[PDB]
Design a protein around this ligand. Structure first.
Ligand SMILES: Nc1ncnc2c1ncn2[C@@H]1O[C@H](COP(=O)(O)OP(=O)(O)CP(=O)(O)O)[C@@H](O)[C@H]1O
Ligand SMILES: [Mg+2]
Length: 245
């Protein structure tokens, strides 16, 4: 589950979206090797449940870091903070905060020196996190996402339509394409540096068989393909590639 800082971000941002956050703020320092912080405005965790959820994903994260989670439940005036180091609860505290949850993961794998030493360079880890937040942004257009890395605001995306969200992410104008129990919706831009993104139902799909086929029927083309299927095609993708101008 947790091999590097991007895995941590993934789990925290999933938790935020699970909690109906409309704003998710991510901050990384030293590529996430020093700090990973994820803050959301979702419904929070009741004080009675804060100690439980550390012990699943949070337990596995808290076991390999210096870990704080603070949360204010939508029904409570104050929040509660739990502090954990390598699985060992150091204590809890009442904290003033906004409704929502904020998790801080520091010194990832400090207890596992070889694993820390073999982590990729800061800039490599940074890009993985950037790509992951883009991925989440592309399927959550109603959600605001911000990314700070080494104190710079690297990504800021406000709530918008889906087409507006695509164009903000890829910094380009797209044409929207649609086809047909299968439904396909794609945003393409033809000049670019080819990039081929595939989402099936709501999830990002990395398959090499589909990508190279998108490169085949579409152009250096940006293709962002949202596919919906029943609990399980390529000729419909070829049909889709025939609608542009
Ligand atoms: N940002 C957040 N907002 C609200 N609740 C949160 C939260 N982060 C964690 N939680 C609560 O903590 C619980 C445990 O989170 P954790 O990620 O460890 O397990 P999970 O229930 O999400 C299953 P998994 O992550 O393995 O799919 C969640 O079920 C949720 O109740
Ligand atoms: Mg989770």
């Amino acid at each position: 589950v947790i091999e590097s800082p991007v895995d941590v971000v993934k789990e925290l941002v999933e938790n935020s979206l699970d909690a109906k956050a409309t704003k998710v703020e991510v901050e990384i320092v030293k590529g996430g090797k020093r700090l990973i912080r994820v803050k959301d405005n979702g419904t929070g965790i009741h004080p009675e449940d804060v100690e439980k959820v550390v012990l699943e994903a949070l337990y596995s994260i808290s076991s390999v870091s210096k870990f704080k989670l603070r949360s204010r439940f939508f029904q409570e005036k104050e929040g509660k903070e739990i502090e954990v180091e390598a699985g060992n609860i150091l204590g809890t505290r009442r904290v003033g905060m906004p409704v929502g949850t904020e998790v801080e993961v520091r010194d990832l794998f400090f207890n596992l020196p070889v694993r820390r030493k073999f982590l990729k360079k800061e800039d490599t880890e940074r890009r993985k996190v950037l790509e992951l937040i883009k991925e989440y942004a592309l399927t959550n257009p109603e959600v605001e996402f911000t990314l700070f890395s080494e104190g710079r605001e690297t990504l800021k995306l406000k709530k918008s339509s889906l087409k507006e969200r695509v164009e903000e992410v890829f910094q380009t104008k797209t044409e929207e394409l649609y086809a047909e129990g299968i439904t396909l919706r794609a945003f393409v831009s033809r000049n670019q540096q080819g990039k081929y993104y595939v989402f099936i139902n709501k999830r990002p799909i990395q398959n090499k068989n589909l990508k190279e086929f998108l490169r085949k029927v579409f152009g250096k083309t940006l293709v962002v393909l949202y596919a919906e299927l029943p609990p399980f095609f390529l000729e419909l993708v070829r049909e889709l590639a025939g609608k542009e101008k």
